[PDB]
Symmetry: D2
């Protein structure tokens, strides 16, 4: 039911990177424990990286991605993958229109860092 919400280990540094593939200017909001900590804005139809930041998951470890285009919330898809019981990817696609490529904004969260 929930898409684009992930429970990270507490107080963990993570990377968050957003790609754009749409005619529409993407706005990507990163909320940690229900507070906006990063906003990425930009327009590309060729997978430009419109932001890449290192954030901290805080006490609650809650990380939510929200995507909007010209004030309209995009439909999200997401999952988390763990490799070798250690390397974590939290993955978000988003759809701003009708073609259902779900790539309009793509967000990759990765941890651990360092």
């Amino acid at each position: 039911a929930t898409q684009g919400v992930f429970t990270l280990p507490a107080n963990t540094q993570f990377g968050v990177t957003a790609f754009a593939n749409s005619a529409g200017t993407q706005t990507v909001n990163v909320q940690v424990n229900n507070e906006t900590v990063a906003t990425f804005t930009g327009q590309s139809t060729n997978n430009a990286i419109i932001g890449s930041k290192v954030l901290n998951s805080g006490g609650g470890g809650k990380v939510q991605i929200l995507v909007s285009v010209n004030g309209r919330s995009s439909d999200l898809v997401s999952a988390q993958v763990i490799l070798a019981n250690e390397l974590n990817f939290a993955l978000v696609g988003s759809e701003d229109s009708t073609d259902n490529d779900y790539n309009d904004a793509v967000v990759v969260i990765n941890w651990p860092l360092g």
Copy 2:
């Protein structure tokens, strides 16, 4: 060591189910916190279920799958996928020969239950 080991939430019920797709008789050992708690043995080239059990992850939450054929450890491949930040799959494939279909024994761990 780097594949077929999964850290589950402590004290959690989970399912483990093994399928066989090989000429060779598969043995799957399930260790929970470094103790063997279930063993599945069988032969099938048509995806037969050679065992399914509900176990508890215990204090440490450590679950390790070992696969061997005729006393020879198989090469493993594994990942964990989480859907909707809630539904967990720990997946193992194994290879007992040279064709690298990694389906000789296939193990699926799922939680939560109930």
Copy 3:
């Protein structure tokens, strides 16, 4: 996003297995190229396998999982993951009520076989 729909290679044997974790009796329908080829019905709150079958993907490769409880459609979550570029899992979780554990029927599709 459509969920529970997977494009397989054409004319390929796969396995499909369903587990139940609900007070409600689950009915899982498997559609291959828009025709029902398997129906699994059962009831368990302890991960019982309510069905397992070997099918062929046919000419179009389209496999769709539908889940219902007492004739009412469950909400689905899904993803596909590929290990070692060869071993394929298509995963489905489903929700029949309000608790959002999405394990009420759990469906696992695996290929290749043999």
Copy 4:
């Protein structure tokens, strides 16, 4: 190699993005149908992007990632995940030493683009 090799749909544009999390300088080589078409070199312990390109998977679709540190091949872990039967991620972790964080170079391949 059984890791870091992916069969993309033929003739498809994809993104490839590498991040570094190691004291050692990472060299990521991207081979498309067995030709090297990108080389990313850099050093970061804080998830800096050391490269990002848009490439075409060509007639055979084969994409391989190789990672080395001062001429020494790293151990790889990898998987592909598909959301909504449409949005694809091929994911690579690599380990250059003994701690098994598998984040020393992290490579994300995404498609479709546009």
